[PDB]
Structure formats: C-alpha cells, structure tokens
Design a protein around this nucleic acid. Structure first.
Ligand SMILES: [Mn+2]
Ligand SMILES: [Mn+2]
Ligand code: NA
Ligand code: NA
Length: 326
DNA sequence: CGGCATACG
DNA sequence: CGTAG
DNA sequence: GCCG
C-alpha cells in the first residue's frame, strides 16, 4: 500500500465503508477544533481503507498499512470487536459536534464563524434567523435556501443544469465548452452541488467570459444568489414537477492551456488533490495547483494537453476520475 | 522534530 | 472571513 | 495523528 492517496486507485464504493466512516467522524471533529494535522491523518487512514481490495476482519491486517498508528488502530479494533467505537459515539452525540456540523454546513459559514457562534451560545438555525443583522448576504442566502441545499442533487438534475449553462455559455461566447467536474465526474449518482468547467479552444478567448455567462443566467431568472473573475459560487433555480428547488452550482473558467490542471483540481476528491500536491512538492520538487505545474529550478511551467500528461510528468500511474475517490 | 495543498471571491 | 477541489 |  503506497503512502500517498494519489499513488493508489480509490473507488467510490468499497469494502470497508463502516470503518472509513468512523475514522471520518474523528477527522471532521478534529477539523471542528482547528486540528488540521489530526484531520489529515484520520482522513488518510480512512482513505487507505477505501483502497483495500477486501474487508478488514482482524487487527493484524492493519500492520504495515500507512497512516495507521495507535489511535486509528484502536478505533478499528473496537469496531471489529464490539461493532461500535466509544470515542466515535461520544463525538456523534456531543452538542459541540452536532452544532458545528449544522453551522458549517451552511453556505457562507466556515469553522471559525461556526465556532464563534457556538461560543456565543447559538445552537439552531432559528437562533441565526432571529438575529439576521449579524449575517452576511452570502450567509443569508445559505440560511434561506438551507433546506433545498440539504436535499440531494440527482444526475437528472445535473443534465438539466448542464443544458441551461450551455445555452448561456453559447451566447456569451460561441465555441466555448462546458465540462461536468466534481463528484459527478468521479461517478457519484448524487451530490450536494454541481460543478462546471468552461473554456474555449482559442487561447485568450475565454478572457472576461464568466461575467457574460452570469448576466445571461441572471436575465433568464435562473440565479437565486451570486457574488457579483474566474470562479462563481451560485445558487440556481432548478425546475421540478410544478415547482423548483435551489441548487448550489459552481462555474469556473480556465484558458485552454490551463484546462487539464483545472479539470484535475476540480474533479477531486479534496483529499486526492491535497495528496497529489503534497506528492508533487515533496517527492518530485514541483509545485502543483489548478493553473499549472511549476519547476522552481528551471523556473518553467509544464505544458499539459491532458490529465494523462500531468500524471506522466509526476511519474504516477494514470487514475481515471472514478478511481480518485480518496 | 516540522510538516501537513494551494488557490480565488 | 468565505469559497473550491 | 502520523511519517519521514
Ligand atoms: Mn462538487
Ligand atoms: Mn461545488
Ligand atoms: Na459552510
Ligand atoms: Na486564474
């Protein structure tokens, strides 16, 4: 088992779902207390389990696996023995975890805002609605639309949304293309948001595109919320039987030179991208982001024409999107 | 021990 | 501060 | 919390 998530296929569905989940609860809780190091380790340990070819049935099968030390191993041990890990259950039950989860799930609220609100004694969504003068416009939108935003987005919704985005994009700039990215590109059948990546085959033609797309979507009555320039985090109005629902949509523009890097980054998973960037820097001495891959010795950027190019330039075996579910 | 990804709005 | 993967 |  290699040590970095970008070095191993991780399928969407796997053979250690209960174990990986429990570890992810501990990761999430560590994040709520500002412990990014502990979050990372619990996430990595969970991901290692997702990459295994069969179920872990005995403690000995953890020996030699990366990111499994005393703590993660004890969690698995307790799950294998008793079907439950007391630490995990204590977190699940806790007022702190439940409230931080509720608040951080709101669009416009991060850990720091959620934590301050927690310390002020706030606990429920209606507590936040009672004091709306404190809220940002983005948090107001997140709170107004919270119920719809909690409802899973289906693949039929995605196809509907892609058509409307394409229409606006085609008027904004003929020849521009729209690519589905994020969790849906990794093969998820549902999600809590939709992500699109827009470019144009002629380098430079994509300059100034996003405002033009946004204004057209706005004039179609489709935008319930937007911030307004290359990333737009919107709430769209999606048609439903005799009605509609609010849906989070992210629209991203990149020049065709950067498209493979943007595609890679926006396809995820989050852990996969962190691990890939960590690997690039620490193992290969190259600096990776969603715009490019930089050699800080030569002071040059790697020109990639495809995701395949990028994996090759990092010396990694290619993983299709459905094996990047770290 | 230090490091933990790296951006844009 | 929020957002993204 | 774990790794190198
Ligand atoms: Mn997404
Ligand atoms: Mn998104
Ligand atoms: Na949030
Ligand atoms: Na840019």
């Amino acid at each position: 088992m290699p040590a970095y998530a970008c070095q191993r296929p991780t399928p969407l569905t796997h053979h250690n779902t209960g174990l990986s989940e429990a570890l992810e609860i501990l990761a999430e809780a560590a994040g709520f207390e500002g412990s990014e190091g502990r979050l990372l380790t619990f996430c990595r340990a969970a991901s290692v389990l997702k990459a295994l070819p069969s179920p872990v049935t005995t403690l000995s099968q953890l020996q030699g696996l990366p990111h499994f030390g005393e703590h993660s191993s004890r969690v698995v041990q307790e799950l294998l023995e008793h079907g439950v890990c007391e630490e995990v259950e204590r977190v699940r039950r806790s007022e702190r975890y439940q409230t931080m989860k509720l608040f951080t799930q709101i669009f416009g609220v991060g850990v720091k805002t959620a934590d301050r609100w927690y310390r002020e004694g706030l606990r429920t969504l209606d507590d936040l609605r009672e004091q709306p003068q404190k809220l940002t416009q983005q948090q107001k939108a997140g709170l107004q639309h919270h119920q719809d935003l909690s409802t899973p987005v289906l693949r039929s919704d995605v196809d509907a949304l892609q058509q409307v985005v394409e229409e606006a994009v085609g008027q904004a700039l003929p020849g521009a293309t729209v690519t589905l990215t994020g969790g849906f590109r990794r093969g998820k059948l549902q999600g809590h948001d939709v992500d699109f990546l827009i470019t144009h085959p002629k380098e430079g033609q994509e300059a100034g595109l996003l405002p033009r797309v946004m204004c057209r979507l706005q004039d179609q009555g489709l935008i319930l919320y937007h911030q307004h320039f290359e990333r737009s985090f919107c709430i769209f109005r999606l048609p439903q039987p005799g009605s509609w629902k609010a849906v989070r949509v992210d629209l991203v523009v990149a020049p065709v030179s950067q498209f493979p890097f943007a595609l890679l980054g926006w396809t995820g998973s989050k852990l996969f991208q962190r691990e890939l960037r960590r690997f690039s820097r620490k193992e290969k001495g190259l600096w990776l982001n969603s715009h490019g891959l930089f050699d800080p010795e030569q002071k040059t950027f790697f020109q990639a024409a495809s995701e395949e190019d990028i994996f090759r330039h990092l010396g990694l075996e290619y993983l299709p999107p459905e094996q990047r579910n770290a």
